[PDB]
C-alpha cells in the first residue's frame, strides 16, 4: 500500500466536502480561501503595477531583514484581512525569487518566519476579529474575485 494513495484521496475528499458547504474544523475551508485570496491579490497587483516577484532582491544573509522590513511596514497602520492576504502573497513571492536564484535553502526559513510573525503578531488580531471563521465567511467561494468581476 502507498500512503500517497491515501493522501491523494483524503485531500480530494476534504476539498470536495468543504466546497459543497460542509464544515467541522474548517481547516480545508481556510486553506482554500487563502489560495483563492492570494491569487486575487496577486492578479490585482500585477494589473496595477508590475508582478510582485519582479523587484525583490535577497541573499541568505540579507534575507531576514528584507522580510521583517517589508512586513512591519505593511502592518504599521494596523491589521485587516486584505493585508493578511498580502502578507501570504509576499511570502510566496519571496520564495519564488529564492528558488529562481537557486537559494532554495531560504524557502523553509521564510516559511518559519511567516509562521512566527503570523503567530506572534497576526493571530491576536484574528482571534479578536472573529477568527479564521470570519475570514472564510467573507472571502470563501472566491468572493473577492467575484466582487471585481461584477464590475
Amino acid at each position: 500500500m502507498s500512503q500517497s494513495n491515501r493522501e491523494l484521496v483524503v485531500d480530494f475528499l476534504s476539498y470536495k466536502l468543504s466546497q459543497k458547504g460542509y464544515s467541522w474544523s474548517q481547516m480545508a475551508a481556510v486553506k482554500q480561501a487563502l489560495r483563492e485570496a492570494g491569487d486575487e491579490f496577486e492578479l490585482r497587483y500585477r494589473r496595477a503595477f508590475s508582478d510582485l516577484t519582479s523587484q525583490l532582491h535577497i541573499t541568505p544573509g540579507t534575507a531576514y531583514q528584507s522580510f521583517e522590513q517589508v512586513v512591519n511596514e505593511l502592518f504599521r497602520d494596523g491589521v485587516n484581512w486584505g493585508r493578511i492576504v498580502a502578507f501570504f502573497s509576499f511570502g510566496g513571492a519571496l520564495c519564488v525569487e529564492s528558488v529562481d536564484k537557486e537559494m532554495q535553502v531560504l524557502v523553509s526559513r521564510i516559511a518559519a518566519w511567516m509562521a512566527t510573525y503570523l503567530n506572534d503578531h497576526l493571530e491576536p488580531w484574528i482571534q479578536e476579529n472573529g477568527g479564521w471563521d470570519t475570514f472564510v465567511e467573507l472571502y470563501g467561494n472566491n468572493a473577492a474575485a467575484e466582487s471585481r468581476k461584477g464590475q
Binding site: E73, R83, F90, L138, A143
Partner: peptide, 16 residues
C-alpha cells in the same frame, strides 16, 4: 522597497 505602500494599497482595496 517603497513598493510596500503599493502592496498595502492593493491589500486595502481587497477588503470586504
Amino acid at each position: 522597497f517603497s513598493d510596500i505602500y503599493k502592496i498595502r494599497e492593493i491589500a486595502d482595496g481587497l477588503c470586504l
